[PDB]
Amino acid sequence: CTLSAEDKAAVERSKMIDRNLREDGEKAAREVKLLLLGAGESGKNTIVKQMKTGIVETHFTFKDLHFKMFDVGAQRSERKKWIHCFEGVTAIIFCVALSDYDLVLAEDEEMNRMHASMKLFDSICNNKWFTDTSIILFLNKKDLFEEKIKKSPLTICYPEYAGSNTYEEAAAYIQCQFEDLNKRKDTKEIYTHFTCSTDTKNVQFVFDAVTDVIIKNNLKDCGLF
Amino acid sequence: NTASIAQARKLVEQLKMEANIDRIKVSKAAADLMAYCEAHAKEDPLLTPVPASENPFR
Amino acid sequence: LTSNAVLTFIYFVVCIIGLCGNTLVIYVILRYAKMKTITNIYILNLAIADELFMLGLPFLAMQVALVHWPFGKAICRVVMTVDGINQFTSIFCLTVMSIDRYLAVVHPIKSAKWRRPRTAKMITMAVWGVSLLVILPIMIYAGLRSNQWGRSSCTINWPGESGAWYTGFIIYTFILGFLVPLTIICLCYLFIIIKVKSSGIRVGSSKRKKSEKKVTRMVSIVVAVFIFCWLPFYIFNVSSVSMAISPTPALKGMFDFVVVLTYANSCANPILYAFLSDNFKKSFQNVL
Amino acid sequence: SELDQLRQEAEQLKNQIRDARKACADATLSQITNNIDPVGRIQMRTRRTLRGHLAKIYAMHWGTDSRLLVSASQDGKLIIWDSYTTNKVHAIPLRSSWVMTCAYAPSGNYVACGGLDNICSIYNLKTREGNVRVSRELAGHTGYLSCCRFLDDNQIVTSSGDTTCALWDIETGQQTTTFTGHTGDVMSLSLAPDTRLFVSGACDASAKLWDVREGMCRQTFTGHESDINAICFFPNGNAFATGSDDATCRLFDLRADQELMTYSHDNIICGITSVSFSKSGRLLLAGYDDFNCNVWDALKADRAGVLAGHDNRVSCLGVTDDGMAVATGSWDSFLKIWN
Amino acid sequence: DVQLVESGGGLVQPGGSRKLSCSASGFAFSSFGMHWVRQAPEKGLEWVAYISSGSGTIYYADTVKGRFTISRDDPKNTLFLQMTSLRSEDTAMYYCVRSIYYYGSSPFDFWGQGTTLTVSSGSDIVMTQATSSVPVTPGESVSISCRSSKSLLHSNGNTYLYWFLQRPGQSPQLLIYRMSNLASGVPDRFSGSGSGTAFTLTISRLEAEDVGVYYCMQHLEYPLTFGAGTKLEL
Amino acid sequence: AGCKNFFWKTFTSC
Secondary structure (H helix, E strand, O other), rough: OOHHHHHHHHHHHHHHHHHHHHHHHHHHOOEEEEEEEEEOOOOHHHHHHOOOOEEEEEEEEOOOEEEEEEEEEOOOHHHOOHHHOOOOOOOEEEEEOOOOOOEEEEOOOEEHHHHHHHHHHHHHHOOOOOOEEEEEEEEEEEHHHHHOOOOHHHOOOOOOOOOOHHHHHHHHHHHHHHHHOOOOHHHEEEEEOOOOOOOOOHHHHHHHHHHHHHHHHHHHHHHHO | OOHHHHHHHHHHHHHHHHHHHOOOHHHHHHHHHHHHHOOOOOOOOOOOOEEEEEOOOO | OOOHHHHHHHHHHHHHHHHHHHHHHHHHHHHOOOOOOOHHHHHHHHHHHHHHHHHHHHHHHHHHHHHOOOOOOOHHHHHHHHHHHHHHHHHHHHHHHHHHHHHHOOOOOOOOOOHHHHHHHHHHHHHHHHHHHHHHHHHHHHOOHHHHHHHHOEEOOOOOOHHHHHHHHHHHHHHHHHHHHHHHHHHHHHHHHHHHHHHHHHHHOOHHHHHHHHHHHHHHHHHHHHHHHHHHHHHHHHHHOOOOOOHHHHHHHHHHHHHHHHHHHHHHHHHHHHOOOOOHHEEEEOOO | OOHHHHHHHHHHHHHHHHHHHHOOOOOOOOOOOOHOOOOOOOOOEEEEEOOOOOOOOEEEEEEOOOOOEEEEEOOEEEEEEEEOEEEEEEEEOOOOEEEEEEEEEEOEEEEEEEEOOEEEEEOOOOOOOOEEOOOOEOOOOOOOOEEEEEOOOEEEEEEEOOOOEEEEEEOEEEEEEEEHHHHHOOEEEEEEEOOOOEEEEEEOEEEEEEEEEOOOOEEEEEOOOOOOOEEEOOOOOOOOEEEEEEOOOOEEEOOOEEEEEOOOOOOOOOOOEEEEEEEOEEEEOOOOOOOEEEEEEEEOOOOEEEOOOOOOEEOOOOOOOOOOOOOEEEOEEEEEEOO | OOHHHHOOEEEEEEOOOEEEEEEEEEOOOOOOEEEEEEEOOOOOEEEEEEEOOOOOOEEEEOOOOOOEEEEEEOOOOOEEEEEEEOHHHOOOEEEEEEOOOOOOOOOEEEOOOOEEEEOOOOOOOOOOOOOOOOOOOOOOEEEEEEOOOOOOOOOOOOOOOOEEEEEEOOEEEEOOOOOEOOOOOOOOOEEEEEEEEEEEEEOOOHHHHHHHEEEEEEEEOOOOOOOEEEEEOO | OOOOOEEEEEEOOO
C-alpha cells in the first residue's frame, strides 16, 4: 500500500521499538522513587548503610516493592537548575541530626547547624515543584541527644523555649518546630521518625509511609479524598 | 591569602586583552545583517513557504 | 388532565439537564487534558451510557402525556432495547468503578500490576457486551398491545396466560441489577474505609479526621443516591406482580415519578463522579 | 595593599571598555530597519507529532541531512526519529536516567548524551554487530553537564554547572582544553559555522566568546538581568541571540562588541528555554514557559506568529539545516514538526 | 567476529525431510532479519525464504510454498529451515543471509559459508545480464550492465538494486546496496550508477582480487530475484 | 397476554 518492502520492514521495527518502550514504561511506573536530602553529613550515610561524583542511586526491595532512592549530595551547584527533574518523586526523605543544636558549621562562626537544616527544610518543603509531595522526616542520633541534653540545655538553639530540660519534651518541641514550617498543610503531610534504632525498623517506617502516600494518591486520583 | 592577588592579576589581564579589540560602527554591522537577510530571503522555506509539491512534510 | 402537563415537563427537564451535564463532562474529558488514567476511561464509558439513556428517555414522555403510543412497533422495540442496554451498563459500570477503587486502595501493590489501560478497555468492552446479553428477553418479547378503546402501551408482550413470566422477569432483574451490585459496592467501600483507618493508624499521621470524614461522606452519598433512585421502582413492580392494584390518578403520578427516578440517578451520576472529583476540577477550571 | 590598586585598575578598564562601546553607537537597528517591508504573519501548521516518550523531554538535535532526530527524556532512553515517516530508528537505553542534553554528530555516526551523572557518553550508531554501544564515557566534570556539541567525529565540547567548559578528544578520552572565567553555572553552548569559535551562557548573566584552538576568552557580553538559558549564532557567524529568565531575548554583535536589539513584550512574563534562527536569519524562534513559542522579527522586533499546541513547558527547539521545518519538544512528552 | 555457520546438509533421498540449522555468533540475532538463498551447481542464486525480526512476517518463494518452513530460536541464536517433500530440483548450496532494515541500513551485508544438500535420483520482476563472460586485463575499467523488466525508482526516491561479488570457492559479498552506496569494507574503486531500468557497475583500476561472478538483485517487492551473473576472467 | 396494569417502565391497560 504505497510502501516499499524496506518501508514496511522499517515500520515493523518501529512498532517493535514502541512495544519495548511501553513494556519498560509499565515496568518503571511501579517503582517507588525517593529523593534523599540532608544538611551536610548528618545521617545520610548511616541510613544508606542501614537500608543498603554526581548523583548516587541505591536499589533495594522490601516486600515485593522496588525502591529507587536518589542521593543528591556532592552536587555543589545551583539547586533551582535541576530540582524540577525530581518533580514526580513519590516522597522526599529528610535527615536531621538531633546532636547538632550545640554545633557550628565552622564556615559561619555564628550560624547554628540546626537553623541551617531548618532553612534548607523550609526551602525544600515550600518549593513550587513539590506542592503535593510528602516528606518523610528522619531524626537521627537520639541517644547522643539524650546524653548531651543533660549537660547543655536546648535554650541555646531555641531561646524562646520554656519547657523542662528533659529528652521527651525537647524532642517533641524540635519535631513541632520542624512540622510547623509546612505552609502547604492542605496538600502534603510530614511523617516523622526517631531513627536511632540499630534494628531493621527504619525501612519498615519508610514502607509504611510510602504505602500511606500511595493510598492517599490513589484516593485523590479517584476522587474520594 | 596570596591567591587573591593572582586572581586579580588574571582578571586585569583578561580585561586588558579584551579592551584592545578593533571595533566597527554599529551602522556597518546593521548594514551587513540587512544585506545577509536580504540576499537569502528567497532560500528560506519558513519566511517564504514552498509549494506543496516541494514540501517534504506534505 | 393536569398530570400530563405537570409530568411531561418533569421528564423533559430531567432529560435536558442529564444531556447537558453528560455532554459537558464528555467534552472536558475528550482530548482536552484527559485520556491518561483508568478512571477517565470508566467515566467516559459511564457518560456514554448516561447520555444514550437520556436520549432514550423522552420517547415515553409522550406516552405518559397522551395515553396511547403513536410511534409504531419498531420504535417501541428500539426504545426498550436501548433502555435495557443503557440501564444495565450504567449499573455494571458503577460496580466496576467500585471494584477498581477497592483494588487501588486496599491492595495498592498486588492490584497495581493488573491495572493497565488495556485491561480497562477490555473490561469496558466486556461490560457493554454483558449489558447487551442480559437484556435479551426485552429484545425478543417487547412490542405493542392494543385495548378496547383503541390505545396501546410500549410494554413487554409476554407469551402465555400464566403470570409466572412477570414474576420471573421481575425477580431476575431485581436480583441481577440491584442486589449483587449494591452488595459489591457496599463491601468495597466498607473495606476501603477500614483500610484507610488502618493505614492512618499504622504510621501515626495527622489529619485522620478529615480524610476519614470525607471518604465516609463520599460512600454515604453514593450509596444513598443509588438506593433512593433505584429502590421504589422495584417495590412497586414487585407489588404489582404479587398483589392486584386498582388504577387511580394518585397512583398514576406515583408510578410516573417512580419511573423518572431512575433517569434522575443517571443524571446525578456525572455530578458525583466528575464534577466533584478534585482531579477533574483543575481541568474544569482550566476550561473556565 | 595591592588588592585595592588592582580592583581600581580593573574598574577603570571596565569604564574604558564601556566608553569605547558607547562611542561606537551612532544609530540603532530600529532606526535603520524602520523603512523596510514588514514580515507579515507567519502561520505554521503541525505536520508530525512524534510519540513514544513517557516523561519530560529535555533536549533534541537535528541531523545534518535534515531528516533524522535524536531526543532525550527522563525515561532514560534516547530515541532516533525518521521525521518524514514518524518512524523510530533506534531506542538507546541509558545507564543514568537524568539526561539533560543530547547531540547528533555532523557525520551521522555518533550520538552524545549527558546530565546529572557528571559523565558525557558517546554512542556508536553504526556497528557491525547491529546494536548501539557506548564508545567513550568522558569523565572529569564536577557538576551537571548541561550542553554538548560535536566539532567533528573526534572532538566534542561540553558545558557543565561547575563554571567550566571543556574540549575533549574522544579517541584518547581526555580533556584537551579547559575554558575558565565564568562565575556561574554554564547553561548553553552554540558552535560557529566555521567551527572555530563558540559562545557560552551562564547564570551570572553573561556571554563569552571563546577560541577553540587557543582556549582564550575574546569578548564578554552583558546586558541581561537574569539567568541565560539559551544561545544561538546568526547564520553568517557575526551575531547571536540569548534567552534568559527575565522574559527577554537579546541580539549581540561580535564585531561591534555591543547589544543590537531587545525582544520583549508586556504579556510575556515567563522565562525562555530555547532560541533558534531561521536559515536566512530573519525569523528568531523562541520557546517560552507559557507553553507556546513566539516567532520574532530579527530586524524589526515585532512578533510574527505563535506556535501553540503544547500542554506544558517548551524545552527544546530546532531548525533543520535547509530551513524546511521547526521541531519543538515539551514536558508533555511530545515533539511536533512545523512548516 | 561475526559468523554464521550452517549445518544439517548431506545426501537425502527424494520425498524425505531434513532440517538445516544456522547458528549465529557475534551479533544481535534478535534485531536482524534472516534469508535463505540457494545456489544450484549451474551458478545461479535463487531466493528461498525470509523471516523478520520478532517472527512477525514470513515470506516464501513460489516454488517452496507448502514444502519449506522457516523459523528461528532467539535465545539459542539459531535459524531453522524445515524441508518437506524434497525433489531433485532442491539440490543446491544453501546460504544464511543477515539483513536489517531502517533508514540508511545495509541489508544483505553478511552471508554464511553455506551447506551442501544433494538429492539423488508470472508477475516476478525479471532481470537479465546479457554478458555472461567478459575477458579482461588487470588495470583497465570494467562495465557490467543489468537491466530490469520494471522500473525500480519508487515514489519515495530510492532505487532498490543491489550488487554482489562471489569469488571462486567463497561466499557472496555486498558491493552496492542502493544503486549508488558503497558497502562497508569495500574499496572506493567500485562505483555504481543508473536510472530507471538501466544500471551499470564500474570497476576502475581492476586488480586480480576482483575476479569472480557479479550478481544484481532487486528488493522492490517479493520474491527477490537475481541475475544470471557476469563472470570476469583473467 | 395477562391483563396487567403496572409493569416495566410503562403503564399498560386492559
